[PDB]
Scaffold this motif. Sequence first.
Motif, PDB file in Angstrom:
ATOM      1  N   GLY A  98       0.790  -1.210   0.000  1.00  0.00           N
ATOM      2  CA  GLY A  98       0.000   0.000   0.000  1.00  0.00           C
ATOM      3  C   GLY A  98       0.809   1.240   0.000  1.00  0.00           C
ATOM      4  O   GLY A  98       0.202   2.347   0.197  1.00  0.00           O
ATOM      5  N   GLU A  99       2.104   1.190  -0.203  1.00  0.00           N
ATOM      6  CA  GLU A  99       3.008   2.323  -0.084  1.00  0.00           C
ATOM      7  C   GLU A  99       3.233   3.020  -1.371  1.00  0.00           C
ATOM      8  O   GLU A  99       3.825   4.168  -1.338  1.00  0.00           O
ATOM      9  CB  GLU A  99       4.346   1.839   0.439  1.00  0.00           C
ATOM     10  CG  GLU A  99       4.270   1.288   1.852  1.00  0.00           C
ATOM     11  CD  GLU A  99       5.536   0.546   2.246  1.00  0.00           C
ATOM     12  OE1 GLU A  99       6.532   0.413   1.455  1.00  0.00           O
ATOM     13  OE2 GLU A  99       5.589  -0.072   3.313  1.00  0.00           O
ATOM     14  N   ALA A 100       2.905   2.442  -2.514  1.00  0.00           N
ATOM     15  CA  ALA A 100       3.024   3.076  -3.847  1.00  0.00           C
ATOM     16  C   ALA A 100       1.899   2.616  -4.686  1.00  0.00           C
ATOM     17  O   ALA A 100       1.327   1.554  -4.497  1.00  0.00           O
ATOM     18  CB  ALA A 100       4.382   2.699  -4.458  1.00  0.00           C
ATOM     19  N   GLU A 101       1.586   3.441  -5.690  1.00  0.00           N
ATOM     20  CA  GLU A 101       0.559   3.119  -6.676  1.00  0.00           C
ATOM     21  C   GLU A 101       1.192   2.784  -7.995  1.00  0.00           C
ATOM     22  O   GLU A 101       2.329   3.163  -8.242  1.00  0.00           O
ATOM     23  CB  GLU A 101      -0.423   4.274  -6.907  1.00  0.00           C
ATOM     24  CG  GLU A 101      -1.100   4.699  -5.639  1.00  0.00           C
ATOM     25  CD  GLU A 101      -1.857   3.625  -4.931  1.00  0.00           C
ATOM     26  OE1 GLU A 101      -2.323   2.605  -5.445  1.00  0.00           O
ATOM     27  OE2 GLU A 101      -1.990   3.735  -3.668  1.00  0.00           O
ATOM     28  N   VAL A 102       0.503   2.053  -8.830  1.00  0.00           N
ATOM     29  CA  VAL A 102       0.886   1.821 -10.235  1.00  0.00           C
ATOM     30  C   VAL A 102       0.026   2.715 -11.077  1.00  0.00           C
ATOM     31  O   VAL A 102      -1.201   2.738 -10.936  1.00  0.00           O
ATOM     32  CB  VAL A 102       0.732   0.346 -10.576  1.00  0.00           C
ATOM     33  CG1 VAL A 102       0.786   0.154 -12.029  1.00  0.00           C
ATOM     34  CG2 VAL A 102       1.800  -0.474  -9.810  1.00  0.00           C
ATOM     35  N   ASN A 103       0.646   3.490 -11.950  1.00  0.00           N
ATOM     36  CA  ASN A 103      -0.022   4.427 -12.801  1.00  0.00           C
ATOM     37  C   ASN A 103       0.590   4.332 -14.212  1.00  0.00           C
ATOM     38  O   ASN A 103       1.465   3.502 -14.466  1.00  0.00           O
ATOM     39  CB  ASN A 103      -0.089   5.812 -12.169  1.00  0.00           C
ATOM     40  CG  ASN A 103       1.271   6.338 -11.948  1.00  0.00           C
ATOM     41  OD1 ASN A 103       2.204   6.153 -12.745  1.00  0.00           O
ATOM     42  ND2 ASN A 103       1.454   7.091 -10.843  1.00  0.00           N
ATOM     43  N   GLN A 104       0.171   5.250 -15.107  1.00  0.00           N
ATOM     44  CA  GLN A 104       0.708   5.172 -16.459  1.00  0.00           C
ATOM     45  C   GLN A 104       2.138   5.643 -16.563  1.00  0.00           C
ATOM     46  O   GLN A 104       2.766   5.419 -17.629  1.00  0.00           O
ATOM     47  CB  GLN A 104      -0.206   5.863 -17.453  1.00  0.00           C
ATOM     48  CG  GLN A 104      -1.512   5.087 -17.628  1.00  0.00           C
ATOM     49  CD  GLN A 104      -2.342   5.528 -18.803  1.00  0.00           C
ATOM     50  OE1 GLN A 104      -2.253   6.686 -19.259  1.00  0.00           O
ATOM     51  NE2 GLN A 104      -3.173   4.646 -19.314  1.00  0.00           N
ATOM     52  N   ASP A 105       2.688   6.286 -15.549  1.00  0.00           N
ATOM     53  CA  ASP A 105       4.131   6.458 -15.562  1.00  0.00           C
ATOM     54  C   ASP A 105       4.874   5.167 -15.313  1.00  0.00           C
ATOM     55  O   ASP A 105       5.999   4.975 -15.836  1.00  0.00           O
ATOM     56  CB  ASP A 105       4.595   7.502 -14.532  1.00  0.00           C
ATOM     57  CG  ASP A 105       4.245   8.902 -14.925  1.00  0.00           C
ATOM     58  OD1 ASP A 105       3.424   9.159 -15.743  1.00  0.00           O
ATOM     59  OD2 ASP A 105       5.106   9.728 -14.504  1.00  0.00           O
ATOM     60  N   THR A 106       4.306   4.282 -14.510  1.00  0.00           N
ATOM     61  CA  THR A 106       4.892   2.984 -14.338  1.00  0.00           C
ATOM     62  C   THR A 106       4.980   2.236 -15.629  1.00  0.00           C
ATOM     63  O   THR A 106       6.013   1.623 -15.979  1.00  0.00           O
ATOM     64  CB  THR A 106       4.016   2.139 -13.324  1.00  0.00           C
ATOM     65  OG1 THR A 106       3.599   2.983 -12.195  1.00  0.00           O
ATOM     66  CG2 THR A 106       4.826   0.927 -12.887  1.00  0.00           C
TER      67      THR A 106
END
Length: 131
Positions: A98-106
Amino acid sequence: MALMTWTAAEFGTNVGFADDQHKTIFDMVNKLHDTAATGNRSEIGKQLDALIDYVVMHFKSEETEMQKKGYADFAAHKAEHDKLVGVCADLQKKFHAGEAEVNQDTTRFVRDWYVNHIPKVDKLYGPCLSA
Ligand SMILES: [Fe+2]
Ligand SMILES: [Fe+2]
């Protein structure tokens, strides 16, 4: 639009298994890229984990072939693979905490990685692995 499009001019290695595995990676990244525009966190995590497992298997496949054939640049090539795997495992640890998200920069990051690695690193093994 799909994030990633494979073509032979851009990415063909003249090594059939490797081209097939790259096509799979591109498809799996494209699914992740789509889901990363949403808030469906469980679906992001399923697709993240599926992608990364596959990527590790692809790198193992290339490494076994490179090493058994005495490919000239095996160890340096494997070092590139191992650094990406470390990045991916770290991302999984943080995402699954829960410490980071996956987004379109990933997903653009991983696209960047593949679009550089395949032409500049993988294509170099073609003459050895296709012989
Ligand atoms: Fe590759
Ligand atoms: Fe590679």
